[PDB]
């Protein structure tokens, strides 16, 4: 009828909004702020805000908003949501250095101990989406949000069932039901779309785009966006020396990968951040050099007779990652490295054991809200939530800490470029490609989001005709 089936990669365990951006993606939850289609930060649930000094954020909430269970969105509900999310999530906690929150009616006041200009931007983070902390259901299974579709049932790691929330504050949502199912294999997602088992899929493998394009019942949408694929190193393993990271950095053929593996739907990467961001000063592009890799590896004493052995993790959800792993393995052998590839079903869980891997294929949304600070804090500081390999360098830390309280934007740019320059010397990770997000749908599905932040998908205007 007007039911929509969606097939996504990257199965979840908990679907608490502070554990995953999936509730925001599928239309169940909303943050106080959002980014619009051009990537700029906008008030979402907020009616008005002010910053009377650099440690004070005053917010007035819209007055016409309910949770999906009929409860009013008040300042007190927002206070308990943010406080709960900070308590339960390191990601949220390290992005929001809030010292206190007071609330009355629709107004709340958020304080920090020192200036943190990125605070408003991080309140647009989907992990900071607002839910009813007093709801009498398990937030890990059926969180209650303000979004147009309420989560009604969750089969853990498999399927989410959602229903139209008819009192949604922006307008009557246009679908009756949404069913979301997880499928890690990109080729199966496409087969599900072609056979009409699903209506909307993300992370289309680049080698299926033409097949979908030729189908008049289907359509493909692409967006260059801000997602970067990389090779992430485990810095807790002593064999992963700077010589080893540099060697592997030179075994990668970024240009070749962008052309033949991404078939032109990507650009070769240097830093974490897409070079289409105007103020970023990218480091020099590393070009494949097998001899140099062999040389560097000799420094640590590796040879054809006694090669470096590397356990490399990969996963199917981002479909090109394992294709890259395959060519890395093949090329690395020429440089006296024996790579064992292990593909896993739950990448985030697997990487938690730092004794179980030396490097991993990976992908992250490195600049979702227009500022580089989020990435540096979560990926390059010890215990940052996406720092899977525990990279940390006190000199980089110092610049990051200075960035965090820097208000002048031109100065933020300069410090950010200094962090890029200094950290690149360490090769904390090898950034491979800035790669487009590709979404495909039945041609009857209208008004889903494919925008550069790579987070949103469903909103109250998404429909079926
Ligand atoms: N950050 C990685 C792994 C992941 C799993 N779930 C969410 N993220 C990616 O998005 O590909
Ligand atoms: N999967 C999203 C969100 C995320 C947070 N941590 C890991 N992943 C990304 O990689 O951009
Ligand atoms: Ni991710």
- Say how many Å lie between the first and final Cα of the chain, rounded: 10
Cβ of 357 below 6 Å from ligand 2: no
Cβ of 226 below 6 Å from ligand 2: no
DSSP3 helix / strand / coil % (the chain, rounded to 5): 30, 25, 45
What are residue 108's phi and psi, to 5 degrees? -130, 155
Residue with the smallest CA separation from ligand 2 atom 11 is 365
What are residue 223's phi and psi, to 5 degrees? -145, 130
Do 447 and 199 meet the contact criterion of CB atoms below 8 Å apart? no
- Residue 281 CA to residue 415 CA, distance in Å, equals 11
The dotted CATH code for 224-436 is 3.10.105.10
Do 405 and 116 meet the contact criterion of CB atoms below 8 Å apart? yes
Report the sign of the C-alpha dihedral through residues 387, 381, 39, 108, in that order. Answer: positive
Ligand 2, from 348, 351, 364, 437: best to mutate by most atoms within 8 Å of Cβ? 364
Cβ of 127 below 6 Å from ligand 1: no
Residue 303 DSSP label: -
What would the two tokens of residue 67 be? Answer: 């949770």
Do 391 and 235 meet the contact criterion of CB atoms below 8 Å apart? yes
Report the sign of the C-alpha dihedral through residues 166, 167, 168, 172, in that order. Answer: positive
Residues of the chain with CATH 3.40.190.10: 1-223+437-465
- Collapsed DSSP state (helix, strand, coil) of residue 168: coil
- Collapsed DSSP state (helix, strand, coil) of residue 330: helix
Residue with the smallest CA separation from ligand 1 atom 6 is 10
- Residue 216 CA to residue 213 CA, distance in Å, equals 7
Output the CA angle 272-82-437, nearest 5 degrees: 30
DSSP state string for 20-64: -SHHHHTTS-B-SEEE-TTS-EEESSEEEEEEEETTEEEEEE-SS
Cβ of 211 below 6 Å from ligand 1: no
Q: Give distance in angstroms: CA of 431 to centre of ligand 1.
A: 15
Q: Give distance in angstroms: CA of 152 to centre of ligand 2.
A: 24
Among the listed residues 459, 437, 454, 6, the one whose alpha carbon sits nearest the alpha carbon of residue 193:
6
Residue with the smallest CA separation from ligand 1 atom 11 is 363
Residue with the smallest CA separation from ligand 2 atom 8 is 364
- Residue 273 CA to residue 365 CA, distance in Å, equals 9
Cβ of 368 below 6 Å from ligand 2: no
Q: Give distance in angstroms: CA of 141 to centre of ligand 1.
A: 20
What are residue 202's phi and psi, to 5 degrees? -120, 175
What would the two tokens of residue 190 be? Answer: 């496409």
Q: How far is CA 268 from the centre of its chain?
A: 19
Superfamily of domain 1-223+437-465: Periplasmic binding protein-like II (3.40.190.10)
Cβ of 318 below 6 Å from ligand 1: yes
Q: Where are the alpha helices (DSSP H) in 38-195?
A: 75-88, 90-95, 119-122, 186-194
Do 338 and 384 meet the contact criterion of CB atoms below 8 Å apart? no
Q: Give distance in angstroms: CA of 226 to centre of ligand 1.
A: 14
Residue 39 gets the label, from left (phi > 0), alpha (psi -120 to 50) or beta, of left
- Collapsed DSSP state (helix, strand, coil) of residue 147: coil
- Residue 323 CA to residue 341 CA, distance in Å, equals 11
Residues of the chain with CATH 3.10.105.10: 224-436
Look at the block and give the residue holding tokens 């010589």.
243
Q: Give distance in angstroms: CA of 408 to centre of ligand 1.
A: 32
Do 357 and 315 meet the contact criterion of CB atoms below 8 Å apart? no
C-alpha dihedral (17, 21, 24, 30), degrees to nearest 10 = 50
Residue with the smallest CA separation from ligand 2 atom 10 is 364
- Residue 317 CA to residue 348 CA, distance in Å, equals 12
Among the listed residues 454, 288, 458, 274, the one whose alpha carbon sits nearest the alpha carbon of residue 368:
454
Do 144 and 137 meet the contact criterion of CB atoms below 8 Å apart? yes
Cβ of 361 below 6 Å from ligand 1: no
How crowded is residue 113: how many other Cβ atoms within 10 Å of its Cβ? 10
CB burial of 378-414 (b: ≥16 within 10 Å; e: otherwise) equals bbbbeebbbbbbebbbeebeebbeebbebeeeeebbe
Q: Give distance in angstroms: CA of 368 to centre of ligand 3.
A: 12
Cβ of 460 below 6 Å from ligand 1: no
38 Cβ contact partners less than 8 Å away, ≥ 6 residues apart: none
């Amino acid at each position: 009828g007007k039911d929509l089936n969606i097939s996504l990669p990257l199965k979840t365990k908990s679907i608490a909004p502070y554990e995953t951006d999936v509730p925001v993606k599928i239309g169940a939850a909303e943050s106080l702020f959002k980014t619009n289609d051009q990537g700029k930060i906008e008030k979402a649930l907020v009616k008005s805000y002010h910053q009377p000094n650099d440690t004070t954020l005053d917010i007035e909430l819209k007055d016409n908003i309910k949770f999906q269970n009929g409860q009013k969105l008040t300042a007190e509900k927002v206070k308990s949501s943010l406080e709960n999310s900070m308590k339960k999530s390191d990601l949220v906690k390290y992005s929001l250095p809030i010292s206190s929150i007071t609330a009355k009616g629709q107004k709340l006041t958020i304080k920090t101990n020192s200036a943190y200009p990125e605070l408003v931007s991080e309140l647009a983070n989907p992990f900071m989406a607002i839910y009813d902390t007093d709801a009498k259901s398990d937030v890990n299974q059926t969180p209650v949000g303000t979004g147009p579709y309420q989560i009604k049932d969750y089969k853990q790691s498999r399927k989410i069932s959602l229903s139209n929330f008819k009192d949604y504050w922006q307008g009557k949502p246009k679908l009756d039901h949404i069913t979301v199912t997880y499928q890690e294999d990109g080729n199966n997602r496409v087969r599900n779309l072609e056979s009409q088992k699903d209506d909307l899929i993300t992370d289309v493998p680049v080698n299926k785009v033409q097949d979908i394009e030729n189908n008049q019942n289907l359509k493909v949408s692409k967006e260059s966006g801000f997602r970067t694929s990389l090779l992430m190193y485990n810095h807790t393993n002593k064999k992963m020396t700077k010589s080893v990271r540099e060697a592997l950095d030179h075994i990668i053929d970024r240009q070749g990968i962008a052309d033949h593996i991404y078939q032109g739907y990507a650009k070769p990467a240097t830093s974490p951040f897409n070079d289409k961001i105007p103020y970023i000063k990218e480091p020099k592009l590393t070009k494949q050099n097998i001899e140099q890799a062999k040389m560097l590896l000799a420094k640590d004493g590796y040879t054809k007779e006694h090669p470096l052995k590397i356990k490399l993790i990969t996963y199917d959800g981002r479909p090109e990652l394992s294709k890259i792993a395959q060519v890395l393995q093949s090329d690395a052998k020429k440089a006296n490295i024996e790579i064992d590839i292990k593909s896993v079903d739950d990448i985030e869980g697997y990487l938690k054991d730092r004794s179980a891997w030396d490097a991993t294929m990976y992908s992250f949304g490195t600049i979702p809200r227009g500022d580089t600070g989020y990435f540096f804090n979560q990926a390059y500081k010890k215990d940052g939530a996406i720092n899977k390999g525990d990279y940390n360098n006190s000199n980089v830390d110092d610049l990051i800490n200075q960035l965090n309280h820097t208000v002048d934007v031109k100065e933020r740019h300069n410090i950010s470029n200094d962090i890029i320059k200094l950290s690149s010397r360490d090769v904390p990770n090898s950034y491979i490609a800035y790669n487009d997000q590709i979404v495909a749908a039945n041609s009857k599905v209208k008004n889903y989001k494919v925008t550069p932040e790579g987070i949103y998908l469903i909103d109250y205007r998404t429909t079926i005709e």
